[PDB]
Design a protein around this nucleic acid. Structure first.
Lengths: 158, 50, 196, 134, 68, 61, 38
RNA sequence: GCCGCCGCAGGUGCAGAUCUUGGUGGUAGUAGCAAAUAUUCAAACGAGAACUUUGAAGGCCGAAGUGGAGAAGGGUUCCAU
RNA sequence: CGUGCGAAUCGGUCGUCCGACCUGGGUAUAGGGGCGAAAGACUAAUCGAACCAUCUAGUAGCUGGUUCCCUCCAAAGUUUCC
RNA sequence: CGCGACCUCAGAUCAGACGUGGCGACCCGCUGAAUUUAAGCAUAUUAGUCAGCGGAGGAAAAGAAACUAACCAGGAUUCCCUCAGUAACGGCGAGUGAACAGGGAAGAGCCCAGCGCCGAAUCCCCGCCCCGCGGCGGGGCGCGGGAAAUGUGGCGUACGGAAGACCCACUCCCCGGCGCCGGGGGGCCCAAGUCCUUCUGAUCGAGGCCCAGCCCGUGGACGGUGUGAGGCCGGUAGCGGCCCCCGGCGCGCCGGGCCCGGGUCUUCCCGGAGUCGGGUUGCUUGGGAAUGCAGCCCAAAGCGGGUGGUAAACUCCAUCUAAGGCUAAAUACCGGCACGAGACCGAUAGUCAACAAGUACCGUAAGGGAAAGUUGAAAAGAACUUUGAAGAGAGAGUUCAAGAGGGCG
């Protein structure tokens, strides 16, 4: 007995959906598991921050959303060439490096070079051995002033 | 079968030892839930499966 | 013995019961945030309303005059005998003696389902920071210790009965003015909420 | 209060662990408190029971100040049999009446090296628990 | 897999793993991947996720939340 | 027991031994590689670990 | 044959090797050691 | 071990469905203990003998038997107390 | 007899009985298939398509039933279509 | 005929290593029917559906571009949300039906064929002795042999690499034992009343315990104890106490292999085949002048080729280069190993099975499949007399009561 004027739909319940049932039982359990995994990772990497490697400034496609700034994968080859630091040396100090990304914007090129200069100014490098320092190391005061930055390091703001 | 076997004969020999009921000392103890032997067999009643 | 019994159906022996229970039933109910705001509100004005305390059944005669706020040295106590001495100096012992007296037994199926012992709910106490107050007050039942900002509606209204008395501290009594404030001024610690 | 989730707090599970238990656990369950003088002297709250130990009846009908020796220990019902606790069957003989070991005051313990080891362990635990509190 | 000259080589230690037993039976080799048909492009929207069966399972299921 | 400890003390020094004296365990723990074979790293991997190891670093506040 | 699966299960028989496999797994697979004597 | 009161929740209200299981009646001390000839006396262990024991008499099956032995099948069904 | 001794027995009673005679054991032929001196005849007390389990809680404009109280309001067997 | 080898193919109780199969909740690759919906029914839908075959793991699948894409662009994989049930498919009817976009768990990269530089400059097995190993590890000796030039060791993978020349400055790279330096597992024990009056069956019951409103509380969770116990006991609390064992992480020691780099100019080198693709025919998808696979035929191009959601001709530009491969991360668990919890049920209910339950039992078989709790706190289970062959009665005894009499709430 169909009723009066109203909306119409296609209720996809003709199949045996009681066989394939996957409801959300472990939402807070998965949240506590991710929390404990993140705390275990933060206790694993002691000098390293929670975010780790920094992310470049990324322009957007899809002209509905072209007035945004994203955080992509890593820095580009021309960016590392203008920065001057070799990529195999910069990978060891925790910098996201990928040769696949393109470069079609001099403004974001200069912005990523400025981001790398800010990371170089904020960089604190530890010695290889705590008993004996080496040549390319920082002062002893910065080793004590260095700590875990809780949060994303140098966040992108509009 | 008048021509008797070897393995089924030992099976029947084990059933003849299982045929005997419970003793008298088993219910004299503390824990006595068994009143009598339930798993019994009779040669006219039970035809031994098969 | 089971031969032509027909055990299927709800009317027969076993088989299935009518309307089997659902794991995908909507057990939980979501609540809007602004409704939780008004649920947290309208509590202190009713707990101070002294008639609701007598309607609940607490001994209100022992407190002469205070919506009870004690000094900051309460968290410094770490002994149950010091807690009993503080309750005797504040004279609030009859409300917990009523809890020790009312030790009736539950009538139902909850006796074999780990819900046997029941008792009377006492007054709540709100602390600000831990200084050994939990290690002292975890043994004595009835007195529930809560946080200043983190409050629950279920503990403020046990069983839909508003009137349960709440003991505060000096730091919490100063922190409530920083949290809520007044009608025209919004919350400083929170983002934006005005009093109605 | 309890704050350990491994601790069993189920009524049927405690009633299962009370009855169903092997012999060394049943022997440790069967215990009795000491007297007021011996408790103050040894600083021991409670000790297990033995066939050689002496037993007085504390509560019940046939109570008094009679020093009774344990006849034999029956751990299936968690019971002992006291020497001067019995009643007459109608045929003429006498049958001892079993008394639960919780209603037992201790007048004398049969001291052995293994018994003195348990006394020294309980006294050391009592002294450590008193020193950590005071 | 049990020969010593193959076993000592670290370049073939992934071949002798117990996870990779019977690759040719499941069809995870080159011919097994070419017989199904998959790759990269906008025309391939049926191997997203794990595989065709996993994508079909993620399509034809429902998700019921806690508070709804 | 005494004959078995005498036999294992006799055959401990020799390389070859019967299958009963060899340790019986689960299949996934039997069919493995050797401990030195798990430590056999390739020359190019050792060259990469020699040239560029992971450094210890941090950032300022 | 749903009832034929539950007629002849693995839990019906001995599991004389399986129970000592679990009893060695709960220890951690020690291979022929000796306990400490007096 | 249980009741009332303030809110909430249900596997919450039975007379039937040739409804399910279980229990009990009129019937009813009814119908029945009829396929194939046949039994009768003395004593006896035993409290107790139309049915069992021995002693006697009279018969049946009539060698294609109401006889003795086998195979399949049954599995202590054979004997003693 | 026909709520049997019997989920197909017995009495009177026959056709045939040196040859198209019955048959004891082992083996071959199994289900849109087999066998069949041809009767949808038979195939384990079931044969116009054998037994058991699953889809299956298949379909049913069709029958059978569907449980506390009190108060107020208060119906149609038709226009047209398939 | 006679003498020595290369290739094809031979048999094992030759030394030594593998597979067989029970089970499998999750997963991978294939075959994959109709009851039904379309009030009939064949196209469609149910439906890559049950079922069947093969296979290992605590996960598998999975992964670094012949990508999304016409934007001011991003750049390995995975799950969730919006997208929206949106475009579309469909007797355009019923019905079926994705992602690009953005935000979070996530971060690990690369290596081979070819190309060429260096005296196969490359390694295995067996024996001797020495150190040692319930993962026989390394070296010393071996015209003792075999393999491999039909191609082995490093450099070496698309982001360019290498060599020559020119400047700079550097000393650590991992592994095996020894001794120090402070998370886990198995155990063992730790407080306060049996204080007074009284009741019955015992009290765990009622009253009081002062001016100390009896006592302890980093212990009033839980259970038993002749009725409803914080103080009778087991145990509870403790980053508390005691014993044993393992590894993790920071320092010293010798021992094994181990001397290998950044910038500028010039020259050579460079790509993976009967594979793409075209004609024809089925399967399947939302995929629709074809999204992909497969059966037959043809089958290349190397400023070469795939795609640019409309087929075919004339063109400009944007994308990386299928035809070689590895890789943990968030993802699933209905069976098993250890537990905890519950607004679930309470002996015809709950797993069919709370007990010697797939047990007894039935069928020639694949198979089917039950009925079943509440003595007394404590057996103190009835001694003694009589009737009677014994069964079965009539007086006594226990206990608070037989008003609890061996199938006894």
């Amino acid at each position: 007995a169909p009723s009066r004027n109203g909306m119409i739909l296609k209720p996809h319940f003709h199949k045996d959906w009681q066989r394939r049932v996957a409801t959300w039982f472990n939402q807070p359990a998965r949240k506590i598991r991710r929390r404990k995994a993140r705390q275990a990772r933060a206790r694993r990497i002691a000098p390293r921050p929670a975010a780790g490697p920094i992310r470049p400034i990324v322009r957007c496609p899809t002209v509905r959303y072209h007035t945004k700034v994203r955080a992509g994968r890593g820095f580009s080859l021309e960016e590392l060439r203008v920065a001057g630091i070799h990529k195999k040396v910069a990978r060891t100090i925790g910098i996201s490096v990928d040769p696949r990304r393109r470069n079609k914007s001099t403004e974001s090129l200069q912005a990523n070079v400025q981001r790398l200069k800010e990371y170089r100014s904020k960089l604190v490098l530890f010695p290889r051995k705590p008993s004996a320092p080496k040549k390319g190391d920082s002062s002893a005061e910065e080793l004590k002033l260095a700590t875990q930055l809780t949060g994303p390091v140098m966040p992108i703001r509009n | 079968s008048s021509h008797k076997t070897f393995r089924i004969k030992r099976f029947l020999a084990k059933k003849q030892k299982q045929n005997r009921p419970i003793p008298q000392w088993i219910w004299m103890k503390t824990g006595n839930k068994i009143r009598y032997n339930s798993k019994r067999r009779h040669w006219r009643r039970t035809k031994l499966g098969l | 013995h089971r031969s032509g019994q027909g055990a299927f159906g709800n009317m027969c022996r076993g088989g299935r019961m009518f309307a089997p229970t659902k794991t995908w039933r909507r057990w939980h109910r979501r609540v809007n945030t602004t409704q939780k705001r008004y649920a947290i509100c309208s509590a202190l004005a009713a707990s101070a309303l002294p008639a609701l305390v007598m309607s609940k059944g607490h001994r209100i005669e022992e407190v002469p005059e205070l919506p009870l706020v004690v000094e900051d040295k309460v968290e410094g106590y770490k002994k149950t005998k010091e807690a009993v001495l503080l309750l005797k100096k504040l004279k609030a012992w009859n409300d917990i003696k009523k809890v020790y007296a009312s030790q009736r037994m539950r009538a139902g199926k909850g006796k074999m389902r780990n819900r046997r012992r029941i008792q009377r709910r006492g007054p709540c106490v709100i602390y600000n920071e831990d200084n050994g107050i939990v290690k002292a007050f975890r043994n004595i039942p009835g007195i529930t210790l809560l946080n200043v900002t983190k409050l629950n509606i279920l503990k403020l209204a046990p069983g839909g009965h508003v009137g349960r008395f709440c003991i505060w501290t000096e730091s919490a009594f100063r922190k409530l003015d920083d949290l809520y404030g007044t009608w025209r001024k919004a919350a400083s610690l929170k983002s934006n909420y005005n009093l109605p | 209060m309890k704050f350990n989730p491994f601790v069993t707090s189920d009524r049927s599970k405690n009633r299962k662990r009370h009855f169903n238990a092997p012999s060394h656990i049943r022997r440790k369950i069967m215990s009795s408190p000491l007297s007021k003088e011996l408790r103050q002297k040894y600083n021991v709250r409670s000790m297990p029971i033995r066939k050689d130990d002496e037993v007085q009846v504390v509560r019940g009908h046939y109570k008094g100040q009679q020093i009774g020796k344990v006849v034999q220990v029956y751990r299936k019902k968690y019971v002992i049999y006291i020497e001067r606790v019995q009643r007459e069957k109608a045929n003429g003989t006498t049958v001892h009446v079993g008394i639960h070991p919780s209603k037992v005051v201790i007048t004398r313990l049969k001291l052995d090296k293994d018994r003195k080891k348990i006394l020294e362990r309980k006294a050391k635990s009592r002294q450590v628990g008193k020193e950590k509190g005071k | 897999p049990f020969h010593k000259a193959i076993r000592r080589n670290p370049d073939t230690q992934w071949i002798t793993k117990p996870v990779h037993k019977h690759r040719e039976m499941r069809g995870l080799t080159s011919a097994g991947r070419k017989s199904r048909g998959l790759g990269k492009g906008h025309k391939f929207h049926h191997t997203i996720g794990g595989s065709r069966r996993a994508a079909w399972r993620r399509r034809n299921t429902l998700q019921l939340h806690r508070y709804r | 027991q005494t004959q078995k400890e005498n036999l294992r003390k006799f055959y401990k020094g020799k390389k070859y031994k019967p299958l009963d004296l060899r340790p019986k365990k689960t299949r996934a723990m039997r069919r493995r590689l050797n401990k030195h074979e798990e430590s056999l790293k390739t020359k190019k991997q050792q060259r990469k670990e020699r040239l560029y190891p992971l450094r210890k670093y941090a950032v300022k506040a | 044959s749903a009832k034929a699966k539950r007629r002849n299960t693995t839990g019906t028989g001995r599991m004389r090797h399986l129970k000592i496999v679990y009893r060695r797994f709960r220890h951690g697979f020690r291979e022929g050691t000796t306990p400490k004597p007096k």
